[PDB]
Amino acid sequence: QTIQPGTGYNNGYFYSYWNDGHGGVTYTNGPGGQFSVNWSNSGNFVGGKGWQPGTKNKVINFSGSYNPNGNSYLSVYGWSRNPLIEYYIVENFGTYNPSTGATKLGEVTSDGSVYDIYRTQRVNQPSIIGTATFYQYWSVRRNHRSSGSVNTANHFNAWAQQGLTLGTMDYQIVAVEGYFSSGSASITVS
Numbered sequence: 120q121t122i123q124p125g126t127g128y129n130n131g132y133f134y135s136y137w138n139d140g141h142g143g144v145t146y147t148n149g150p151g152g153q154f155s156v157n158w159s160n161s162g163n164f165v166g167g168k169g170w171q172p173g174t175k176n177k178v179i180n181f182s183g184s185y186n187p188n189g190n191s192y193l194s195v196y197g198w199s200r201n202p203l204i205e206y207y208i209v210e211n212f213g214t215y216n217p218s219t220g221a222t223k224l225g226e227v228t229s230d231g232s233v234y235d236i237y238r239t240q241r242v243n244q245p246s247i248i249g250t251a252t253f254y255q256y257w258s259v260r261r262n263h264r265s266s267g268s269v270n271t272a273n274h275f276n277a278w279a280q281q282g283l284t285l286g287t288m289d290y291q292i293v294a295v296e297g298y299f300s301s302g303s304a305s306i307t308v309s
Contacts, residue, residue: 121147126171126290132308133171133290138164144297152308153183156295165196165296168308173197173291175275180309181293182266187213189300195269196294201286203246203253208234208274211263213300218259227277229270232262236277247289256283265306 126135129148136146141162147155154168170177185193192212198205209217221237228234237257243250258274275285295304 121145128171129168132168133292134166134168135290135292135294136164136166138162141299143301149305149307153305154295154308155303155305156297157303158297159301161297161300163296163298165294167196167292167294167306169195169197169290169292169294171290173288174271175285175288176272177291179269179271179291179293180267181210181269181306183304183306185211185265185295185304185306187297187300187302187304189213189302190215190298191300191302192217192296193265193304193306194294194296195271195291196296197291198247198289199285199287200248200289202284203248203251204256204283204285205241205246205253206256206258206278208258208260208269208271210260210267210269211265212259213302215298216259218257221255221257224281225277227258227273229258229273229277230268232260232264234258234260234274236281238281238283254283
């Protein structure tokens with residue numbers, strides 16, 4: 120069903136939907152691991168389905184249609200505590216590369232493509248434990264796609280070789296983020 124921002128479980132899957140209050144975004148939970156997002160001249164939002172808690176060796180499958188009209192990205196997104204880390208395994212993006220401004224650490228090959236690895240610090244920013252300072256880790260896929268499988272272990276292992284040691288995994292979802300743009304997406308996670 121179409122819902123306002125919140126979190127919970129739907130048809131077997133955890134979901135999280137958040138927006139900045141701007142307006143112009145419609146998020147709907149669908150059958151199984153499906154979610155749909157339609158937006159038009161939106162603000163900043165993030166929505167998707169997955170697991171709570173996630174794991175360090177989950178193989179995530181996703182398929183569907185991803186049609187951004189401007190700034191937006193499709194990625195595996197989640198958090199870790201001890202250390203506090205916000206991470207992204209970006210599979211596709213619109214007009215803006217989300218890693219712009221982040222520091223490149225290295226590269227990793229996974230699921231049919233090379234990914235560029237970056238990291239950036241967020242100081243006194245909102246987080247799953249409140250206002251805090253933490254790193255944001257990014258794996259950005261070179262060959263964009265809207266369906267496939269992501270072996271998260273390959274990314275966590277590569278990040279560990281670069282010095283990141285994830286601790287307790289919090290939620291882990293396939294998410295569509297939008298940033299003052301328009302678009303539509305219907306994604307099914309499994």
